[model samples]
Target: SMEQVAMELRLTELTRLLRSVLDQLQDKDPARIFAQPVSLKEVPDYLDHIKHPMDFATMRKRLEAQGYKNLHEFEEDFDLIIDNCMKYNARDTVFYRAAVRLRDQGGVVLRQARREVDSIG
Candidate 1:
């Protein structure tokens, strides 16, 4: 029971961290830098297609040409965005993965919390 409680607390902390990162991105206007609305289906294949900053613009155009209108529509496709950006930019993937994992795991925790509470009751 203590282990479960500890795990739940960790999850809550992780979720908070993820939300904080998201908030920071919003505050810093990350959308302006990485707001292209490309399809998730295309992302893995297109990872090597981006060579320069204009390549990102080109990807954005390609998405529009393919009829994707908004980033929100492709929000769930963001893992691809992260993957491609880091791949092309030759940046560290671990940091990105860590954050995403935390965010995802945090969601799992929140969902589990409901189940856990119900079980205890």
Candidate 2:
């Protein structure tokens, strides 16, 4: 289950990083930090694009190819954060909705992905 473990670890790391950023931002202004809603519309596309392990590597490569440009252009602007959150939230919503639809159809794609490594073991 190396892949599953790796995926979980990566997600945990990401969650930690996100929480750390949120904590620092919240200390400056709580209202501005939590006020933003994540967009769900982009989730499906993002998920689709980053589905493969190599795709994640490619994404990192792309980011670096951009000269490691500032991912956040306006850290001090609460409005920008709010807008970004809205977009992220929309993407999240869509991701969950799609997941639900798949589940309702008796699909176990996710389960299969997790157990794939185990099957080989």
Candidate 3:
């Protein structure tokens, strides 16, 4: 179907952009803290404050499953990683600082991807 063809094209672009964003995040998270999901046992009551949890592993699986409709959808999930960290951790903590840095650094990656898509159109 013609619609299927269009979806396939969009997906390839999405896949490439997602890879770039994830790579940047991984580079910043050298401790591998944000690389995986937070364990409830490790951080008791974490979910009590942050309702939505996100991590690189989850995003990778979603990308592989084509769960994302577009880069914007993926961005929301990507951003949630930072958001959840900031929400659950205190401002003076290393985790909070790391999330802030990740957001500021990763913002460039997301903005550049948007420009690339806009130019394609």
Candidate 4:
């Protein structure tokens, strides 16, 4: 019973925090967050977004108990996460196995007609 409560609480918070990860990504440049590996978010942006800072989990158990931005101090796969989320239908549901279903998934393939920059015509 106690464990279930603990698990539920963490997952609930993690869902929000995961979404927070998405929002945090939205606030950042995609290449900035994406080109790097997943392990970096737990480290430092060398940032000052907030004055007092902190840092995700046995991975997410760590995420659930604290501010997500603080947790992002060590991690950020947000572009892939955001891109993956869109592919998976804006996964408001990334907890447990649902989040893992995307393994072996492919990356985006932009056609020549479109590029990564200005669309002024």
Off by over 4 Å in 1: 30-37, 40-83, 86-121
**C-alpha root-mean-square deviation, each candidate:** 14.0, 17.5, 1.6, 16.9
Clashes of 3: 0
The residue pairs in collision within model 4 are: 41-73, 41-74, 41-75, 42-73, 42-74, 42-75, 43-73, 43-74
Q: What is the C-alpha lDDT profile of model 2 across 5-98, one tens digit per residue?
A: 8866655544444344334434443233233333237344544332222112233334333322222321223233333334444555743343
Top model number, TM-score? 3
CA shift at 41, candidate 3, in angstroms? 2.1
Q: What is the C-alpha lDDT profile of model 1 across 1-121, one tens digit per residue?
A: 9998887665555444434433433333333445444444856655357533222344434443433333333233334545555555443565355434444543444455445444643
TM-scores, each model vs. reference: 0.32, 0.29, 0.88, 0.25
Identify the leading candidate in terms of lDDT. 3
Better model by TM-score: candidate 3 vs candidate 4 = 3
Instruction: List the pairs of residues colliding in candidate 1.
Output: none
TM-score of 4: 0.25
RMSD of 1: 14.0
Please give the ranking of all candidate structures by TM-score, highest first, separated by commas: 3, 1, 2, 4
Off by over 4 Å in 4: 30-76, 79-121
Model 3, 1-121: lDDT tens per residue? Answer: 9999998988877787777767876787787778889988988888788888999999888877878777789889988999898888899999999999888888887788888777764
* Stretches of model 2 off by over 4 angstroms after superposition: 30-80, 83-121
